[PDB]
Amino acid sequence: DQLTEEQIAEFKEAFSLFDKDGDGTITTKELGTVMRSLGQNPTEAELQDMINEVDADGNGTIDFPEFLTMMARKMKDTDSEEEIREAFRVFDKDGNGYISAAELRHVMTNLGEKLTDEEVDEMIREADIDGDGQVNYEEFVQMMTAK
């Protein structure tokens, strides 16, 4: 009952990170590219099974509505504990308990978003509640709960 334009913009931004060539469909090559940049090694066949789950029109790729469907199913069903820890591990690359400004910058570049260094620090200071210029695990969890 509505959908806001920034909600639409958020979905478009996510979709466009996978759809690297901007043709409106995500292939196994593209899906694999993102997952590989985040430290994973899916086979071609596994990637195809991922598409198949949501490929409503049967053409072998994911369009925008099919990707929305994917987020509804996968980006919310599991995810509570011991796997939010996996997500933080992606951010906290070296594994010292603290996401530095540079480590955050490294995740954004691997996703596809090549934001400026200034914008990276704007994110840090947003989630940085204890003043040390970094984001520990607890501040990460609280950042995920707010608007």
Binding site: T78, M108, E113, M144
Partner: peptide
């Protein structure tokens, strides 16, 4: 507030998809 939740969502989605 768009930056954090977007990066988190895609990381979490990729984490879920690999099984």
């Amino acid at each position: 507030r768009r930056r954090w939740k977007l990066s988190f969502s895609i990381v979490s989605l990729c984490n879920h998809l690999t099984r």
